[PDB]
Write a protein that binds this ligand. Structure first.
Ligand SMILES: *[C@@H]1O[C@H](CO)[C@@H](O[C@@H]2O[C@H](CO[C@H]3O[C@H](CO)[C@@H](O)[C@H](O)[C@@H]3O)[C@@H](O[C@H]3O[C@H](CO)[C@@H](O)[C@H](O)[C@@H]3O)[C@H](O[C@@H]3O[C@H](CS(=O)(=O)O)[C@@H](O[C@@H]4O[C@H](CO)[C@@H](O)[C@H](O)[C@H]4O)[C@H](O)[C@H]3O)[C@H]2NC(C)=O)[C@H](O)[C@H]1NC(C)=O
Ligand SMILES: *[C@@H]1O[C@H](CO)[C@@H](O[C@@H]2O[C@H](CO[C@H]3O[C@H](CO)[C@@H](O)[C@H](O)[C@@H]3O)[C@@H](O[C@H]3O[C@H](CO)[C@@H](O)[C@H](O)[C@@H]3O)[C@H](O[C@@H]3O[C@H](CS(=O)(=O)O)[C@@H](O[C@@H]4O[C@H](CO)[C@@H](O)[C@H](O)[C@H]4O)[C@H](O)[C@H]3O)[C@H]2NC(C)=O)[C@H](O)[C@H]1NC(C)=O
Ligand SMILES: *[C@@H]1O[C@H](CO)[C@@H](O[C@@H]2O[C@H](CO[C@H]3O[C@H](CO)[C@@H](O)[C@H](O)[C@@H]3O)[C@@H](O[C@H]3O[C@H](CO)[C@@H](O)[C@H](O)[C@@H]3O)[C@H](O[C@@H]3O[C@H](CS(=O)(=O)O)[C@@H](O[C@@H]4O[C@H](CO)[C@@H](O)[C@H](O)[C@H]4O)[C@H](O)[C@H]3O)[C@H]2NC(C)=O)[C@H](O)[C@H]1NC(C)=O
Ligand SMILES: *[C@@H]1O[C@H](CO)[C@@H](O[C@@H]2O[C@H](CO[C@H]3O[C@H](CO)[C@@H](O)[C@H](O)[C@@H]3O)[C@@H](O[C@H]3O[C@H](CO)[C@@H](O)[C@H](O)[C@@H]3O)[C@H](O[C@@H]3O[C@H](CS(=O)(=O)O)[C@@H](O[C@@H]4O[C@H](CO)[C@@H](O)[C@H](O)[C@H]4O)[C@H](O)[C@H]3O)[C@H]2NC(C)=O)[C@H](O)[C@H]1NC(C)=O
Ligand SMILES: *[C@@H]1O[C@H](CO)[C@@H](O[C@@H]2O[C@H](CO[C@H]3O[C@H](CO)[C@@H](O)[C@H](O)[C@@H]3O)[C@@H](O[C@H]3O[C@H](CO)[C@@H](O)[C@H](O)[C@@H]3O)[C@H](O[C@@H]3O[C@H](CS(=O)(=O)O)[C@@H](O[C@@H]4O[C@H](CO)[C@@H](O)[C@H](O)[C@H]4O)[C@H](O)[C@H]3O)[C@H]2NC(C)=O)[C@H](O)[C@H]1NC(C)=O
Ligand SMILES: *[C@@H]1O[C@H](CO)[C@@H](O[C@@H]2O[C@H](CO[C@H]3O[C@H](CO)[C@@H](O)[C@H](O)[C@@H]3O)[C@@H](O[C@H]3O[C@H](CO)[C@@H](O)[C@H](O)[C@@H]3O)[C@H](O[C@@H]3O[C@H](CS(=O)(=O)O)[C@@H](O[C@@H]4O[C@H](CO)[C@@H](O)[C@H](O)[C@H]4O)[C@H](O)[C@H]3O)[C@H]2NC(C)=O)[C@H](O)[C@H]1NC(C)=O
Ligand SMILES: *[C@@H]1O[C@H](CO)[C@@H](O[C@@H]2O[C@H](CO[C@H]3O[C@H](CO)[C@@H](O)[C@H](O)[C@@H]3O)[C@@H](O[C@H]3O[C@H](CO)[C@@H](O)[C@H](O)[C@@H]3O)[C@H](O[C@@H]3O[C@H](CS(=O)(=O)O)[C@@H](O[C@@H]4O[C@H](CO)[C@@H](O)[C@H](O)[C@H]4O)[C@H](O)[C@H]3O)[C@H]2NC(C)=O)[C@H](O)[C@H]1NC(C)=O
Ligand SMILES: *[C@@H]1O[C@H](CO)[C@@H](O[C@@H]2O[C@H](CO[C@H]3O[C@H](CO)[C@@H](O)[C@H](O)[C@@H]3O)[C@@H](O[C@H]3O[C@H](CO)[C@@H](O)[C@H](O)[C@@H]3O)[C@H](O[C@@H]3O[C@H](CS(=O)(=O)O)[C@@H](O[C@@H]4O[C@H](CO)[C@@H](O)[C@H](O)[C@H]4O)[C@H](O)[C@H]3O)[C@H]2NC(C)=O)[C@H](O)[C@H]1NC(C)=O
Ligand SMILES: *[C@@H]1O[C@H](CO)[C@@H](O[C@@H]2O[C@H](CO)[C@@H](O)[C@H](O)[C@H]2NC(C)=O)[C@H](O)[C@H]1NC(C)=O
Lengths: 49, 244, 49, 244, 48, 49
């Protein structure tokens, strides 16, 4: 009996966590590149005159 | 995938009326696991929102599929009477594995040109979107080359500068190995490899240079999270410009 | 059940932090060298006449 | 990796028509952990954006792989009848470990020349991109040496100045130990080591000197963050010039 | 648990490769061990 | 069984042409019950795919 309903919920919870993982990594890659670009623009702003 | 180098952009400098290519480098993040980069499964999208350009998938070819013996000694340069075979894929040995890479985008372009020409000849591909020549005289006899996008690059052969003209049909992307790639033949980037990504612009997207605009590129493999790349592009400052 | 979904999110959050670490160190190395170069050019500017 | 010395640049001064080499020194940052520098896994890229030069990977060789017994007493100088064996890799002992280093780039170049010549002779390498000779008379019989990039350096043997001519095929980089390196044979830079990085220019990139231009170098090992080096190069002021 | 390699498996070092070990006793769940092996860095190297 | 130490690997360093041994340590999980490790009954498999 219980060796099936539990397995289904496990499948669903794994997929749910994998979806957060997917989003978090993508958005970390995005934001860290925005930071890289900003740091470059800050140095350009301080240097150029 | 992590962006693991600067993003380079090329234009018809100083005139700045036309756009040629973008180059950047990627590697698997934090060395944790390998990434499948086969162009049948992976997409590379390109958008320039300000001008309404949006391409859902431009990825077409990979040199990760290609063994050195398929490209080395197979394109050749004529200097007077003398003829010189080129080496394009470099290689080194560690722990009984042969690592394979291209030293620059120019040798990667020549290797791709040959590969695609060979695939057309073998009937595996209908037409090559890329066509590279040293002789400009040919163009008069091939009027389809008149209207598509053209850029040039130079290699040194026998200490002599050779100029090549690259004719591009449509905007497309290809990938090639840069370091840490022993899996020649596979399209798989292993953990601790470095992969060059090059986007060539066709006559549609080339039409005027990116200025005061955001450009976005996304690479989406069949497993794992996609890599999203975004730059606000100020005016380009040289033959190549560093945008990201 | 919970001994799996949590592990996936941990993996993702580690990778996310490692990506910021990678970018921050690279960009620190870059900017500090721009600073070194600037300090040299400042001394050259003050000395040369 | 941290840049842990000045960046040196060499040209055909005062004539300034041609570019020879760049040298700089690196070490693991803040002494925290070791860095893998094997040339099969690591890339070194070189870009000069203003002139459209962009090389994705120029790293080929390392003397970190090489034990002193493989290079010492194996190159020799003829002074009349007399013949002198050179010592190139210096060594010292602390806590039962043998540290290994090269005192200057000149001894590193001679050690590399020998190593590559030996690898070609053993069939492990197809051709050496570097060829060093003291006798210029040989060149007439070897016409491939006529067209590639050439620079010279001098060592003192038996109190006598010996001039060597170094012929370079293509732009490449190599690494060698400078201090704090007990791991001879390994390609691993331990924390608290100092590694020399030398870039030799081939006939392509050598063609005219860097002036009023930005040059960028990036070292990307298989684990950890890459080191990015950038200099705006004013006119070179001597046989060697300090650029960074 | 110690694994000694014979002349077959010894022939060249594990690099840029996944190695998997599994222990399966007669009762209970097996233990599965997996490592992606980068280049070895000393006489002994820590892989997992 | 739990893996209850680091996994150690030995080679003909620095030459790295040949592989010698691997060592690791195991213990019954969470101290719940004993494990039969007789080599007639137990298998240990090894794969390098
Ligand atoms: C790369 O490009 C180089 C030129 O930029 C090439 O070097 C030149 O090659 C010529 C042909 O020989 C080579 O052919 C193959 C290349 O595939 C090589 O593998 C061979 O080893 C061979 O060396 C060579 O010309 C000579 O050979 C002719 C017969 O084949 C002969 O008629 C010539 O006289 C030459 O001996 C070049 O050698 C130099 O040539 C010049 C003349 S020219 O520049 O060739 O026109 C000679 O100068 C003098 O010229 C004056 C006139 O002003 C005469 O009065 C005098 O009698 C004559 O001596 C040189 O003496 C001679 O050395 C050679 N160039 C150099 C600088 O060595 C190279 O082969 C190419 N490499 C590849 C792989 O393609
Ligand atoms: C990039 O890839 C392109 C293909 O997409 C390449 O273009 C092809 O170049 C061939 C020659 O390449 C060699 O020479 C060039 C300089 O000319 C060098 O730069 C290269 O490094 C290389 O060494 C060319 O082959 C023909 O021209 C040669 C002249 O040297 C000659 O020796 C050959 O014998 C060929 O005549 C290609 O031209 C096409 O060739 C095919 C046959 S094949 O594919 O070459 O085998 C012809 O098809 C034939 O058509 C006739 C009808 O006319 C039929 O009867 C016959 O059955 C059939 O085989 C085509 O007609 C002919 O146009 C040329 N291909 C294209 C599409 O232009 C290019 O070189 C690559 N770039 C670089 C830098 O290498
Ligand atoms: C981009 O996309 C373009 C259009 O899709 C391509 O243009 C077409 O190129 C053909 C081949 O030429 C090129 O091939 C490689 C790509 O694989 C290029 O990189 C090179 O630049 C190379 O030049 C060209 O075919 C002709 O050249 C062939 C050799 O290269 C030769 O075998 C053919 O027989 C052609 O002479 C296309 O030109 C068309 O040719 C067809 C005949 S065929 O099907 O190609 O054999 C003609 O159809 C004929 O039409 C006439 C009337 O006009 C009828 O009487 C006849 O019954 C019928 O067969 C077309 O009219 C003629 O246009 C050429 N096509 C177009 C539309 O541009 C281009 O290669 C792609 N890549 C690049 C880099 O630009
Ligand atoms: C780049 O491509 C160019 C053309 O595509 C090549 O030039 C052609 O080569 C011949 C001249 O030699 C050239 O060689 C050196 C090194 O490449 C150049 O630096 C020189 O400046 C020099 O131009 C020349 O061939 C003629 O002579 C041949 C015998 O030596 C003969 O077989 C040919 O038939 C020619 O008479 C070319 O001159 C044109 O050639 C074409 C044919 S092809 O392109 O050579 O194959 C002729 O087309 C013919 O037209 C008739 C109709 O009248 C048809 O019936 C026939 O079927 C067809 O073949 C032209 O009539 C003729 O004017 C010459 N072409 C050009 C435009 O200069 C060049 O060598 C290549 N390489 C470089 C490095 O530039
Ligand atoms: C480094 O280079 C040095 C020169 O710059 C070398 O020193 C000179 O070595 C000569 C040969 O001897 C050496 O050979 C090996 C080197 O591999 C050594 O290990 C040996 O120990 C040995 O010393 C030496 O010449 C002498 O030996 C000859 C027989 O082998 C004999 O014919 C000569 O007469 C010399 O004795 C040099 O010693 C000096 O030589 C000069 C003459 S010359 O300069 O050699 O031509 C002598 O001067 C006088 O010359 C006048 C003519 O003007 C005569 O009238 C007079 O009779 C004669 O005395 C000196 O007396 C003699 O000392 C030696 N040079 C010096 C300054 O000591 C050295 O070996 C090289 N080292 C290596 C490791 O390669
Ligand atoms: C940098 O590395 C280069 C190799 O990439 C070195 O070039 C090679 O130099 C050899 C001699 O080196 C000694 O002498 C020089 C001055 O001449 C000193 O500066 C050095 O310190 C060192 O002490 C040279 O060997 C030949 O010349 C010698 C003259 O002294 C002689 O004693 C030898 O017996 C050799 O004849 C290399 O020349 C090549 O040698 C190979 C054989 S081997 O690799 O030396 O064993 C020959 O191959 C042979 O070819 C014949 C056909 O002709 C076959 O039948 C035979 O089976 C086969 O073995 C080559 O023909 C011959 O050219 C020379 N190598 C090259 C590529 O030029 C260079 O010295 C290094 N730089 C420094 C400063 O050391
Ligand atoms: C840079 O890259 C260049 C081209 O890739 C290299 O040039 C080639 O060097 C060969 C070896 O010479 C040098 O070796 C080391 C590198 O390992 C250099 O550092 C030294 O300077 C050294 O001189 C040279 O081979 C010839 O020299 C050999 C001894 O050094 C000797 O064993 C060979 O047999 C050659 O005599 C290349 O010259 C080519 O030789 C081949 C034959 S082989 O495959 O080399 O054995 C010739 O092929 C022949 O072609 C003729 C017609 O021309 C046919 O009849 C015959 O059937 C066929 O075998 C080539 O024609 C001839 O060019 C030389 N090649 C070129 C294109 O330049 C260079 O070494 C690299 N490094 C540096 C530092 O410059
Ligand atoms: C640098 O390299 C130079 C040439 O590559 C070397 O010079 C050559 O050495 C011999 C002369 O002695 C030299 O020695 C001192 C110290 O090195 C120099 O400072 C002097 O100035 C002096 O030049 C000379 O050899 C000749 O004599 C030999 C017997 O003593 C004999 O075996 C040779 O065959 C020669 O006759 C060289 O003269 C040329 O030698 C070459 C061969 S080799 O280069 O010596 O190996 C000959 O080539 C021959 O050509 C014939 C065709 O006629 C072929 O059939 C044969 O197969 C081939 O061997 C030349 O014909 C001949 O003129 C001399 N070469 C030159 C150009 O000066 C020099 O010693 C080296 N070192 C230094 C420090 O400069
Ligand atoms: C490097 O060595 C060469 C020769 O070994 C030197 O050239 C000599 O220069 C002096 C004057 O400076 C002349 O008297 C000699 O005749 C030259 N030698 C030859 C063989 O021509 C060169 O000066 C040295 N350069 C440096 C910077 O040390």
């Amino acid at each position: 009996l219980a060796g099936l309903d539990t397995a289904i919920i496990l499948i669903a919870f794994i997929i749910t966590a994998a979806v957060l993982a997917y989003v978090a990594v993508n958005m970390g890659l995005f934001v860290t590149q925005k930071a890289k670009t900003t740091i470059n623009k800050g140095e350009e702003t301080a240097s150029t005159a | 995938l992590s962006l693991s180098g600067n993003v380079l952009y090329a234009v018809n400098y100083p005139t700045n009326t036309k756009s040629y290519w973008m180059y950047f480098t990627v590697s698997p993040s934090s060395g944790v696991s390998s990434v499948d980069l086969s162009p049948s499964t992976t997409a590379i999208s390109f958008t320039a929102a300000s001008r309404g350009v949006s391409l859902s998938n431009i990825y077409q070819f990979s040199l990760l599929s290609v063994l050195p013996s398929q490209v080395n000694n197979k394109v050749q340069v004529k200097l007077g009477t003398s003829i010189i075979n080129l080496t394009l894929a470099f290689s080194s040995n560690s722990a009984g594995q042969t690592y394979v890479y291209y030293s620059d985008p120019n040798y990667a372009l020549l290797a791709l040109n040959y590969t695609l020409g060979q695939e057309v000849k073998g009937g595996q591909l209908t037409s090559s979107p890329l066509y590279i020549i040293s002789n400009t005289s040919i163009v008069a006899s091939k009027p389809w080359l008149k209207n598509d996008n053209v850029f040039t690059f130079n290699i040194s052969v026998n200490g002599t500068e050779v100029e090549y003209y690259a004719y591009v049909n449509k905007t497309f992307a290809f990938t090639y190995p840069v370091s840490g790639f022993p899996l020649a033949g596979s399209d798989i980037a292993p953990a601790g490899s470095v992969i060059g990504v090059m986007i060539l612009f066709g006559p549609g997207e080339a039409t005027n240079v990116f200025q005061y605009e955001t450009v976005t590129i996304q690479i989406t493999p069949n497993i794992g999270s996609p890599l999203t790349i975004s730059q606000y592009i100020y005016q380009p400052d040289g033959k190549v410009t560093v945008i990201g």
